[PDB]
């Protein structure tokens, strides 16, 4: 068959528009992964992005956009940069010499999706892991046979592998009180009141105690704008330091891991079968 025409919801304008699968996917790669990544990582990424649309088509419509299979909000579906936007911000030379690589990666995987028992998977992906990916159930609510923790030994080379953020004790309590009106916490005794309660083997903080409150690592990531929910806290004199590992949710495919694998000679099928446990590739058209 031919490549489908899909409905894409523009989260800024509120208008839904028809797009050829290929054009949509090029916009997703431009937004998710740079044209500087290896072609095999870009191919892996294109298959994941295509699979996401197919999965969405085969499952329940969302309330955010019931009349569109996907939207342009990276917080809900996946990133998307339009051609006009890319041309205006990067220029014609970038379109002809760099965006062409993105176009070739997408065309190069025409109609290919990742499958588990012959059905499109939920192909979660993120920037950089802590060295191991996360099982879906330690981050999200459900377990999926293809979203299992795997080693990701090349993520250590990512510029987002490690990060640190210093916050004054005063700003730390002020920020928490603003987000949680019931919190009882003392600016002068933070090291005695704040402690990690539950975390996965990969490292995502599931439960953290802050005075009388229990929050998730994701809650903390959100309040303090951290790169991930995998962190540790150092208590200083008058301040705390968040020491953060990786970037993103940690489930499914690591983008920097795919890049590292590509550099080592792995091809996109092997990258995909590594991150998505017991999966195959299917050409639907």
Residues forming contacts to Cl ion in the complex (CB under 5 A) are 33, 255
Cα separation, 90 vs 155, in Å, equals 28
CB of 217 to Zn ion, least distance (A): 24
For residue 123, report the phi and psi dihedrals to the nearest 5 degrees. Answer: -90, 70
Residue 76 assigned as binding residue: yes
Give 210's strand partners: 194, 213
Reference 53, options 93, 13, 84, 80; nearest CA is: 80
The DSSP H or E segment spanning 6 is: strand 5-9
3-class SS string, 70-94: EECCCCCCCCCCCHHHHHHHHCHHH
Tell me which of Zn ion, Na ion, Cl ion, none is bound by residue 77, counting a contact when its beta carbon lies within the kind-specific cut-off of 5 to 8 angstroms: Zn ion
CB of 35 to Na ion, least distance (A): 23
Cα separation, 93 vs 70, in Å, equals 30
Tell me which of Zn ion, Cl ion, Na ion, none is bound by residue 283, counting a contact when its beta carbon lies within the kind-specific cut-off of 5 to 8 angstroms: Na ion
- State the binding string over 198-237 for Na ion (x if CB under 5 A, else -): ---------------------------x------------
Residue 26 assigned as binding residue: no
Cα separation, 30 vs 144, in Å, equals 28
Nearest to Zn ion of 77, 173 (CB atom): 77
Task: Identify whether the C-beta of residue 199 lies closer than 8 Å to the C-beta of residue 220.
Answer: no
Residue 59 assigned as binding residue: no
Residue 187: CB partners within 8 Å, gap ≥ 6?
Answer: 169, 170, 172, 173
Q: Does 76 bind Zn ion (CB under 5 A)?
A: yes
Tokens of 199: 């975390």
CB of 51 to Na ion, least distance (A): 13
Give the chain's largest Cα–Cα span. Answer: 67
Residue 71 assigned as binding residue: yes
Nearest to Na ion of 96, 225 (CB atom): 225
Tell me which of Na ion, Zn ion, Cl ion, none is bound by residue 147, counting a contact when its beta carbon lies within the kind-specific cut-off of 5 to 8 angstroms: none
Q: Does 283 bind Na ion (CB under 5 A)?
A: yes
Tell me which of Zn ion, Cl ion, Na ion, none is bound by residue 213, counting a contact when its beta carbon lies within the kind-specific cut-off of 5 to 8 angstroms: none
Beta strands at 162-168 and 125-126: parallel, antiparallel or unpaired: unpaired
Q: Does 71 bind Zn ion (CB under 5 A)?
A: yes
Q: Does 110 bind Na ion (CB under 5 A)?
A: yes
Tell me which of Cl ion, Na ion, Zn ion, none is bound by residue 230, counting a contact when its beta carbon lies within the kind-specific cut-off of 5 to 8 angstroms: none
The residues of the shown chain that bind Zn ion, judged by CB under 5 A, are: 71, 76-77
Known binding-site positions for Zn(2+): 65, 71, 76-77
- Interacting residues with Na ion (CB under 5 A): 110-111, 225, 283
């Amino acid at each position: 068959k031919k490549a489908p025409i899909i409905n894409v919801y523009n989260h800024i304008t509120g208008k839904t528009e028809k797009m050829d699968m290929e054009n949509y996917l090029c916009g997703v790669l431009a937004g998710e992964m740079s044209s500087e990544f290896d072609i095999e990582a870009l191919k892996a990424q294109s298959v994941a992005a295509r699979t996401y649309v197919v999965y969405k088509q085969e499952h329940g419509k969302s309330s955010k956009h019931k009349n569109a299979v996907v939207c342009t909000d990276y917080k809900h579906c996946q990133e998307y940069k339009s051609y006009d936007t890319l041309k205006k911000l990067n220029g014609e030379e970038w379109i002809k010499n760099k965006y062409s690589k993105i176009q070739e990666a997408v065309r190069g995987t025409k109609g290919q999706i990742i499958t588990y028992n012959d059905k499109a998977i939920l192909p979660l992906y993120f920037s950089t892991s802590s060295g191991k990916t996360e099982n879906s159930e330690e981050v999200f609510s459900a377990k999926y046979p293809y979203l299992k923790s795997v080693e990701s030994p090349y993520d250590k080379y990512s510029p987002k592998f490690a990060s640190t953020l210093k916050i004054s004790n005063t700003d730390f309590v002020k920020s928490l009180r603003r987000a949680y009106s019931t919190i009882v916490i003392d600016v002068n005794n933070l090291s005695k009141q704040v402690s990690i309660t539950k975390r996965s083997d990969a490292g995502t903080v599931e439960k953290i105690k802050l005075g009388n409150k229990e929050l998730t690592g994701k809650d903390i990531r959100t309040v303090f704008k951290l790169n991930s929910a995998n962190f540790d806290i150092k208590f200083g004199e008058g301040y705390i330091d968040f020491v953060v590992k990786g970037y993103g949710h940690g489930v499914g495919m690591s983008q920097w891991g795919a890049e590292g694998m590509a550099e080592e000679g792995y091809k996109y099928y092997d990258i995909l079968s590594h991150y998505y446990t017991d999966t195959k590739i299917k050409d639907i058209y």
